[PDB]
Amino acid sequence: TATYFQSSDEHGFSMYYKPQVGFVGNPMPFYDPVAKDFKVMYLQDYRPNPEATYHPIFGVATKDGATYESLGELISCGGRDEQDAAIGTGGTIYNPADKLYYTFYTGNKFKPSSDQNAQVVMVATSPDFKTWTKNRTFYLKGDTYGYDKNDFRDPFLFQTEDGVYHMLIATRKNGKGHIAEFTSADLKEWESAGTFMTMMWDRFYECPDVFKMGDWWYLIYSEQASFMRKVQYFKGRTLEDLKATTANDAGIWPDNREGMLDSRAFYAGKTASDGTNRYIWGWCPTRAGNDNGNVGDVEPEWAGNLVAQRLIQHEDGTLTLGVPDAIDRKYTSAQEVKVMAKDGNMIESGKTYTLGEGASVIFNRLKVHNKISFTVKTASNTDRFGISFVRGTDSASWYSIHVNADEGKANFEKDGDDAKYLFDNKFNIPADNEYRVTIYSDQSVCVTYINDQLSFTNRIYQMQKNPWSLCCYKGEITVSDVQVSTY
Ligand SMILES: OC[C@H]1O[C@@](CO)(OC[C@H]2O[C@@](CO)(OC[C@H]3O[C@@](CO)(OC[C@H]4O[C@@](CO)(OC[C@H]5O[C@](O)(CO)[C@@H](O)[C@@H]5O)[C@@H](O)[C@@H]4O)[C@@H](O)[C@@H]3O)[C@@H](O)[C@@H]2O)[C@@H](O)[C@@H]1O
Ligand SMILES: OC[C@H]1O[C@@](CO)(OC[C@H]2O[C@@](CO)(OC[C@H]3O[C@](CO)(OC[C@H]4O[C@@](CO)(OC[C@H]5O[C@](O)(CO)[C@@H](O)[C@@H]5O)[C@@H](O)[C@@H]4O)[C@@H](O)[C@@H]3O)[C@@H](O)[C@@H]2O)[C@@H](O)[C@@H]1O
Ligand SMILES: OC[C@H]1O[C@@](CO)(OC[C@H]2O[C@](O)(CO)[C@@H](O)[C@@H]2O)[C@@H](O)[C@@H]1O
């Protein structure tokens, strides 16, 4: 049957990682060049969190983004009255001169008085990546260098080719958002190098990441602004080009979509490279009440599952995201695809499904970890189609990704009774009106990829062990090479 079944998530996720207890907050991926793998520290979130002492740094290890190994608690919160009562995002770097990993992080004071610093950067080190010792005498207060007392967080650490260590910190100078730069030769003495970049208008870029890839410098960052809540980027051929993008609010977007790389279900993305590939890790939020259509009024729930994506540099230096090769390989078992139900103008024809304005086709039940591929050809580039999940033959409501070629964007929406728009993901519509679609699922977390242009993370409770559906809202489509694979 293709009746709606009441699926639920396992405590843990193995690919779009979540530990057995708690959720994955802001990650901090780092390629450990001694062990030759990625150590992804992340802020461990719990439901609920302590009031003052929350968000310790746990870690997980992976070579490839598909299989993870948990490392447990690495840097504990401080005491209730310490400056690092709560811990916020930071940045690891290995120092070969003393054979110590250094993790800089945000210490978050509980109930800071007016004079006290809410947010201060602090550090721990480790010889193996297992035992971490806090440096109880190191504090980097923005205040000291003319920056903000309470917004001063998310230290990012990188070494240029000159060998100099740099640290970028999300802050404000008299109201306006600035990314602050500090430099050091030895990771211990730090000097202020002024402002690296301005933040546009009244925006606030959390979790900044700066890296070079081919012949381009990039800034990745997550936008705090309530209406955005998406991972964005800028680019420049030189480091001075990069900085110039936001200078005086110059708005030099890297592409036709403001550099928005995904939508509001992928936040806090930061990157790391193994020499071959550069991946990005963010989190896919939970939803209140496990309700796919409750996406928050101002903001999504903070933290959820870890989501690895792969950076695709195009030849104009523009970036999009696709799947990690190792996640694609994980799906070994082919599954029969078969129509369980039709509606309106819908024709099957050997192994090709043709749908017109208002038509629907529902396929057989998915499994728990799914890969879904298919090619869609539209009539025009004003056509609209839908990829729907948790859609049983008895479901009055369900959740679809709408691809609206007229509006040059995909949307996540609730369909049926109580339909509603939720949010969207601008991408480049194919000229040839062909859409090579690929979707990867671990339980309730999935990413949808089209034509190496779209990368759309979504939280979809109960997509597992439930049917899925294609439809056509406008014009006409033709669906081809439909496959489903599992593990
Ligand atoms: O009241 C505590 C309670 O709130 C949550 C759920 O939102 O956590 C946020 C809480 O975590 C901290 C300490 O680890 O670190 C946050 C790290 O995450 C980043 C990027 O996501 O930003 C914070 C995130 O929080 C919001 C919450 O709505 O922060 C709003 C808050 O930010 C300030 O600017 C000061 O933090 C205030 O102006 C404002 O009232 C959201 O808009 C942001 O995206 C990184 O930037 C950061 O390192 C704290 O900074 C934060 O308060 C629960 O998990 C927890 O139980
Ligand atoms: O209400 C937000 C909703 O808009 C939708 C619904 O249609 O839009 C978000 C969507 O819109 C863009 C389109 O570019 O921009 C959003 C802008 O909102 C803000 C906040 O007000 O813009 C103000 C506006 O003023 C300029 C000056 O010519 O600037 C002055 C500027 O300088 C400062 O003084 C500080 O230096 C600031 O305080 C002032 O704001 C204009 O250029 C500027 O555009 C800006 O932060 C954004 O411009 C998209 O970027 C965004 O995705 C819906 O999605 C939202 O819910
Ligand atoms: O009421 C939602 C309904 O609005 C539309 C109207 O065409 O789109 C979204 C609208 O919001 C932005 O994302 C940013 O302001 C823009 O991309 C766009 O102008 C529909 O698509 C949706 O179905």
Numbering used by the authors: 17 to 503
Paper lines:
Glycan uptake across the bacterial outer membrane (OM) of these bacteria is mediated by SusCD protein complexes, comprising a membrane-embedded barrel and a lipoprotein lid, that is thought to open and close to facilitate substrate binding and transport. Here we show that for both the levan and dextran utilisation systems of Bacteroides thetaiotaomicron, the additional OM components assemble on the core SusCD transporter, forming stable glycan utilising machines which we term ‘utilisomes’. Transport-competent FOS are generated from levan by a surface-exposed lipoprotein, a GH32-family levan endo-glycanase (GHlev), while an SGBP (SGBPlev) is thought to recruit levan at the cell surface. Single particle cryogenic electron microscopy (cryoEM) structures in the absence and presence of substrate reveal concerted conformational changes that demonstrate the mechanism of substrate capture, and rationalise the role of each component in the utilisome.
Indeed, secondary binding sites are relatively common in endo-acting GH enzymes, where they may enhance substrate processivity. No ligand was observed at the secondary site in a GHlev structure complexed to a 4 unit FOS (PDB ID 6R3U28), suggesting the affinity for short FOS is low. These results suggest the active site (FOS3) is responsible for most of the affinity of GHlev for levan.
